Each structure stands twice: as structure tokens, then as C-alpha cells.
Structure 1
Amino acid sequence: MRVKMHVKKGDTVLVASGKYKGRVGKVKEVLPKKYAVIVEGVNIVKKAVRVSPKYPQGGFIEKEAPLHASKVRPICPACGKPTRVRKKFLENGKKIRVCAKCGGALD
């Protein structure tokens, strides 16, 4: 129906694999189509740019690469630890993501 995303713009996440394993950053963007996220200051690539009105003089620019969503884990804004996500039904009775280590909200 729709791609499952355990992560969203813009809660804070640990990169748990790859070259940036262990870094922490905000979720800048989520690309459900590719099942990939953009994490601030993580996966920086050097791309060349043509001399243009945008970039006269030109040369290169730094850009963040998309990361496979599985490579990323939200951090609990309560206990402060990287965790998996559970769901919880309130009285509304809406559902929310919650930390599995403590019962913290994850929004």
C-alpha cells in the first residue's frame, strides 16, 4: 500500500553500518521510493558542477548521499539510546512509535 518507514524527517538517528558507522545526525529527508534516508553530515560525496549561473567559477560541491534505511536507527529522546521501534495504542486511540528499551515516546 505504502512503504514501511521506521524513521522520519527529522528525528535523530544513529548510523549503525558502513563508513559512517556510529555517527549521529538528524533525518534531513526520507525517500520511501528508494527506501533510503538523508542524514545530515553523513555520506558526503564530491560532485562536479558545470560553470553556470548557479555556480559560476564552478568546480565541485559537497552533497549528502542517501543511506539504506536499514542502516539507520532512531535515538530515544528519553533514555538517549539507539533502539528498535515498537508501536503503542493510546486512549484516543491513536498509535505512536515507542522506544523498546524504555517506554519513551519517539513521535
Structure 2
Amino acid sequence: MRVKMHVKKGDTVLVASGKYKGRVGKVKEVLPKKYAVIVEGVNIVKKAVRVSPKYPQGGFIEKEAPLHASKVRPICPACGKPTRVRKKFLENGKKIRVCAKCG
């Protein structure tokens, strides 16, 4: 394969692949595609330790990898990110847009 998926927090956007509702980003790696952003409620019961809040049983989490989300752009729907010829920044850029030059 290869290292090509998404980006950083900002807002990202939670969805319903069996979960529902939408929220902001958090963190994300590409190797296996795994990452996080609160919401996804999952608890990993710890072992016979204690150092931490105490012995065994874990807590809150998150969990996913592949596709299955979106981005912010209120009212109407959302689009992509075009280019630059003689406008604002030289001939580069792009920070998630509605369909004009914002988000």
C-alpha cells in the first residue's frame, strides 16, 4: 500500500457507521489507518495493576481507520478545494472549503 489518507483535527467530523452524530478531530496515524477523536465510547478493562487510578479495568477511548466521516461547512452541503492563478496566496494553499474559499 502507501501512506495516503487524511489530515489533522480542526473539526474533522464524526458520522454514523453504527455510531452517529458528528464531532471535532483529535489525532490520527496512517500505518494501519488507526486514530481517535473522543466520541466512540469503548472501555479497555486493565490488568492486576494499581499504579494508575487503580488496579484493573480501563476507560473511555475512540477507534477506527478507513473512510467513514466528513467536514464542516454549516447550512448547505460541502465540496472540495480548487487552485490559484492570480488570487490571494501565490499559486498554493487549501484548508477544507464549502465551495468558494472558506469553511
TM-score by length of 2: 0.29
Q: Is the 8 A contact 1:25 1:40 kept in 2?
A: no
Paired residues of 2:13 and 2:72 also in contact (CA < 8 A): yes
| Cα deviation, residue 7, structure 1 | 3.7
Larger Cα Rg: Structure 1 or Structure 2? 2
Pairwise CA distance, 1:14: 2.7
Unaligned runs of 5+ in 2: none
Residues 3-50 of structure 1 show CA distances to partners (whole Å, capped at 9, x for unaligned) of 321243454323242123445554466665448877687899999967
Quick check: 1:8–1:27 contact (8 Å CA) kept in 2? yes
Cα gap change, 1:45 to 1:7, in 2 (>3 Å): farther
**Equivalence for 1:105:** none
- Give the CA deviation at 1:84: 20
TM-score of the superposition, structure 1-length normalised? Answer: 0.28
Identify which range, 26-35 or 15-24, moves more after superposition. 26-35
- Is contact 2:12-2:25 (8 Å) kept? yes
- Percent identity reads 100
Q: CA deviation at 1:91?
A: 1.2
Equivalent pairs counted in the alignment come to: 102
Consecutive unaligned residues of structure 1, counting only runs of 5 or more, are 103-107
- 8 A Cα contact 1:12 1:25, kept in partner: yes
Moved over 3 A (4+): 9-12, 20-90, 92-102
Distance 1:20 1:76 in 2: 20
